UniProtKB/Swiss-Prot annotation, chains A, B:
Enzyme class: transferase
TM region(s), chain numbering: none
Name of the protein this chain belongs to: Protein arginine N-methyltransferase 7
Pfam families with a match to the protein in the record: PrmA
Protein family per UniProt: Belongs to the class I-like SAM-binding methyltransferase superfamily. Protein arginine N-methyltransferase family. PRMT7 subfamily.
GO biological process: chromatin remodeling; peptidyl-arginine methylation; peptidyl-arginine N-methylation; regulation of DNA-templated transcription
Length: 337, 337
């Protein structure tokens, strides 16, 4: 029995069925928090199937990294791949993947290795793969270090003809006015009681996922105040970290007048004609995508005074932003200059 | 400089303004995650003001427990209280409360003590208070142990005439059909790929806050399948734990046919004519309340087989549920019998 069995931290007066009792809590949390939603993102599933269908033949060797519960590897097998190797760092997720493979009678076709992709070596595979497959995107595109993990494998285990799926990713930002967001991230007072001192603590640094506010952008009123800002784009078959500057500057032309409460972040991943987007405009009828990825937000302070200063846009004016990145390019920040 | 200064865990290439730099991260997180939203719940603020206004005179001594950033104590002072003592377990929140008090020139009226209410003694107050004031409710009404903390103070520090605000609280449950929730908490398959094994892990035990799914009940389609179930009610001036049974049974009559995907939990707190409710029907135009409290959900398994079984309601039929509580009555679970 695992040290972290689900039943352990449940009150003894509360019933727990057998199927849950001796399963590690981390697995139950991961599957319930993320995996059902991912598996119900029908557009994500169709995207990967269609891109794979262009490349998988009975002579195709397929490697998936960050395989999780293994759905995309099942797809490669479904399309008739010569062999599939799925790599998953979580021991329990790896076992779960093996169960799904067993359930679909694909044990002869799909093998799961419990290890990080960084530990993977040529000897662990029958031959260099014809296809490298992954879905390791975050709410921020590079949020789960997708570029770093793909680059590491790309440097070591592939061959010149290997197709990397998906090929392209672009990270966007757009300044938005959003009164609902403003009302859970600021305060001025209550009647004659002054609460402005609370604003000293306003976090205009962190990137926060909409989920963490409890908010779904598609279910609140917000206004984009400019055309999208392309923060950076990568080609996963060729880009490296140094293709993204540690600091960039953007000239943002206001198309609307309003208060830029926040920068809204979303992304778009493509391969040939197929597209997987977290732009709210593309997710209005994709509730599972909005729950699993959603969008990210950073509150904006116009200056660096003792209190934050609202970023106010007037239609037709130019606004300069400085975007700073962490060394792994996973974390960024937008500041009005 | 604090060991947990905000600036510490920020990337060195990312700017942090002075107002944030040396503030403990826990304070910034607490204020940003919860306090702005609370302070923008205008109905919560009006509820407390109006109830206080019925009781506070220039001869009224007021004790607030779980005072946080101190808004309700400011209200008591505003209404002209003889004295106000605010008790707050967080050292940084206590300091923040003192700042707000300073900002409104009420230092002569409101004192903040940094300690847990359980450590509070008669000597810490000028005299037993005329009013005990608190807002320590969770998404689950008793989620932050409100009854336990009020009872402890009620047993020790008050006088016979002390008015306890707020007086009444009722916790509700209602079985709901909700397709959006279902699509992020279950799966069956993708085309000819079977994913039913994933259902072995479905968490039909935990109470989960809607925020944690990323979901706002007022922004998805759901159907209540029966009249509300009153799980328990308390009078904070007289109830104790043993007024809530460790196990209760409920006969729930289906008013609609559908799948009871989950039990939805909400509550209502009252004092005389005034009401503070987390029923989504009462929060449609209260976005800050839905973000700070929202509602809670527990997925329902109809049986205890190797896979979960949907709870299916047919209009006009009786459904028996067994509700089990933890010893502190904070955690509960509903099971179809």
């Amino acid at each position: 029995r695992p040290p972290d069995a689900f039943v352990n931290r449940i009150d003894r007066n509360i019933p727990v069925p057998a199927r849950l009792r001796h399963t590690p809590v981390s697995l139950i949390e991961a599957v319930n928090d993320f995996h059902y939603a991912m598996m119900n993102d029908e557009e994500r599933n169709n995207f990967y199937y269609e891109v794979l269908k262009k490349h998988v033949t009975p002579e195709t060797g397929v490697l998936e990294i960050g395989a999780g519960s293994g759905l995309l590897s099942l797809m490669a097998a479904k399309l008739g791949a010569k062999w599939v190797v799925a790599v998953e760092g979580s021991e329990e997720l790896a076992k779960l993947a093996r169960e799904n493979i067993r359930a679909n009678n694909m044990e002869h076709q799909v093998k799961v290795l419990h290890m990080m992709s960084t530990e993977l070596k040529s000897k662990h595979l029958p031959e260099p793969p014809d296809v490298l497959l992954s879905e390791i995107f975050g709410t921020m595109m590079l949020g789960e270090s997708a570029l770093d993990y793909v680059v590491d494998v790309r440097n070591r285990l592939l061959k010149p003809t290997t197709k990397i799926i998906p090929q392209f990713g672009t990270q966007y930002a757009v300044p938005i006015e959003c009164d609902a967001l403003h009302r859970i991230s600021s305060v001025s007072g209550w009647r004659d009681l002054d609460l402005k001192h609370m604003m000293t603590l306003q976090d205009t640094v962190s990137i926060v996922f909409a989920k963490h506010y409890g908010i779904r952008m598609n279910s609140v009123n917000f206004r984009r105040l400019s055309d999208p800002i392309e923060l950076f784009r990568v080609d996963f078959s060729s880009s490296n970290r140094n293709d993204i500057p540690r600091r960039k500057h953007f000239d943002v032309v206001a198309k609307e007048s309003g208060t830029a409460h926040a920068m809204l972040f979303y992304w778009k991943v493509t391969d040939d004609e197929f597209v997987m987007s977290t732009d709210p405009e593309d997710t209005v009828n994709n509730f599972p995508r909005d729950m699993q990825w959603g969008q990210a937000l950073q509150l904006l302070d116009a200056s660096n005074g003792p209190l934050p200063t609202p970023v106010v846009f007037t239609e037709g004016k130019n606004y300069n932003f400085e975007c700073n990145f962490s060394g792994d390019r996973v974390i960024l920040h937008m500041q009005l200059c």
